[PDB]
Write an enzyme that holds these catalytic residues in place. Sequence first.
Site, PDB file in Angstrom:
ATOM      1  N   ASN A   1      -1.654  -8.621   7.961  1.00 20.17           N
ATOM      2  CA  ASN A   1      -1.892  -9.812   7.141  1.00 20.17           C
ATOM      3  C   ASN A   1      -2.260  -9.271   5.774  1.00 20.17           C
ATOM      4  OD1 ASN A   1      -3.854 -11.674   5.671  1.00 20.17           O
ATOM      5  ND2 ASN A   1      -3.573 -13.019   7.404  1.00 20.17           N
TER       6      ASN A   1
ATOM      7  N   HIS B   1      15.488   0.253  -6.522  1.00 21.76           N
ATOM      8  CA  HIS B   1      15.137  -0.858  -7.403  1.00 21.76           C
ATOM      9  C   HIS B   1      13.678  -1.276  -7.307  1.00 21.76           C
ATOM     10  CE1 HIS B   1      16.020  -4.243  -4.320  1.00 21.76           C
ATOM     11  NE2 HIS B   1      15.010  -4.672  -5.018  1.00 21.76           N
TER      12      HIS B   1
ATOM     13  N   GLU C   1      -5.858  -0.681   8.386  1.00 17.89           N
ATOM     14  CA  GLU C   1      -5.102  -0.295   7.216  1.00 17.89           C
ATOM     15  C   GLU C   1      -5.591   1.030   6.672  1.00 17.89           C
ATOM     16  OE1 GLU C   1      -6.729  -3.286   7.716  1.00 17.89           O
ATOM     17  OE2 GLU C   1      -6.073  -4.743   6.296  1.00 17.89           O
TER      18      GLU C   1
ATOM     19  N   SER D   1      12.879  -6.561   0.047  1.00 24.54           N
ATOM     20  CA  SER D   1      13.581  -5.370  -0.408  1.00 24.54           C
ATOM     21  C   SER D   1      12.831  -4.075  -0.201  1.00 24.54           C
ATOM     22  CB  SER D   1      13.962  -5.509  -1.849  1.00 24.54           C
ATOM     23  OG  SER D   1      15.066  -6.398  -1.924  1.00 24.54           O
ATOM     24  N   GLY D   2      13.604  -3.032   0.087  1.00 23.29           N
ATOM     25  CA  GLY D   2      13.053  -1.725   0.360  1.00 23.29           C
ATOM     26  C   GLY D   2      12.690  -1.591   1.821  1.00 23.29           C
TER      27      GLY D   2
ATOM     28  N   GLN E   1      -6.045 -10.575   4.417  1.00 25.48           N
ATOM     29  CA  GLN E   1      -7.260 -10.530   5.239  1.00 25.48           C
ATOM     30  C   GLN E   1      -7.482  -9.098   5.701  1.00 25.48           C
ATOM     31  OE1 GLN E   1      -8.668 -14.209   5.304  1.00 25.48           O
ATOM     32  NE2 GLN E   1      -6.923 -14.467   6.599  1.00 25.48           N
TER      33      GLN E   1
ATOM     34  N   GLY F   1      11.214 -10.030  -2.084  1.00 28.17           N
ATOM     35  CA  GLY F   1       9.985  -9.442  -1.553  1.00 28.17           C
ATOM     36  C   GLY F   1      10.257  -8.493  -0.395  1.00 28.17           C
TER      37      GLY F   1
ATOM     38  N   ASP G   1      20.998   2.377  -3.463  1.00 24.21           N
ATOM     39  CA  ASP G   1      19.693   1.770  -3.608  1.00 24.21           C
ATOM     40  C   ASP G   1      18.684   2.344  -2.613  1.00 24.21           C
ATOM     41  OD1 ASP G   1      17.838  -0.142  -4.672  1.00 24.21           O
ATOM     42  OD2 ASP G   1      18.808  -1.833  -3.786  1.00 24.21           O
TER      43      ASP G   1
ATOM     44  N   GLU H   1      -0.508  -2.358   8.146  1.00 25.24           N
ATOM     45  CA  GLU H   1      -0.722  -3.640   7.534  1.00 25.24           C
ATOM     46  C   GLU H   1      -0.090  -4.753   8.356  1.00 25.24           C
ATOM     47  OE1 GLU H   1      -2.530  -5.803   6.001  1.00 25.24           O
ATOM     48  OE2 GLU H   1      -2.451  -5.026   4.011  1.00 25.24           O
TER      49      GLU H   1
HETATM   50 CA    CA Z   1      -4.852  -6.971   5.627  1.00 31.29          CA
END
Ligand code: CA
Length: 240
Positions: A61, A45, A69, A188-189, A64, A186, A93, A59
Amino acid sequence: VVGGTEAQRNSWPSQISLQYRSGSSWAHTCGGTLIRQNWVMTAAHCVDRELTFRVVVGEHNLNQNNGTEQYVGVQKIVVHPYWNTDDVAAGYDIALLRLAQSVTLNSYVQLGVLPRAGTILANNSPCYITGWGLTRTNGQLAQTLQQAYLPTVDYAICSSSSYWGSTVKNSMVCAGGDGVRSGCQGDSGGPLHCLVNGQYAVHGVTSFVSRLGCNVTRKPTVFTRVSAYISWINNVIASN
Ligand SMILES: [Ca+2]
């Protein structure tokens, strides 16, 4: 995550941010688990709208710089054949994303461990949900990775009348339901990480909460049970 604490910068290194391009910006939509240097697992989905997507690894924050990352483009999406958008309650799903680069593994970027096929967790097994999703029902996304302690509710109890009844299938895991702590919009997954033989393995992909609200007494957060999909994941990775 409602009723969560902030996660430590390096405690869950396979957690990814699935983001889509909004205007000139990128915006977080879903979580996922890095399972290969070039492959992510997420909920089907999450990739239903045809958007440009990127995966961010390392990741912590969202808004910022963190110095950790790596930002990699998505080259291929393989959703489960049987996924149906109008019936999340049917199950299936799950989707795998091939990345356009292998990422560099390091203490912030690691591959998530998957369970054996057939593995069922016993009632009240210790599990953690992770994500940047909403902190209240109809609230706001978290800037920093959050985590909540979410014990499993086994099938028999979760398919009972006063909980989810018929909505939950055996290919799902239920966790939480105390009215205080939940996944939410948010998250999800993303992973449910459960402790098995001294090792955390990703046992769930976050699928849904109740339409009444994220934290509802007697309605646990529901997850795709990764153990049912082990052959599919491997079959996809061996051919793409
Ligand atoms: Ca960041």
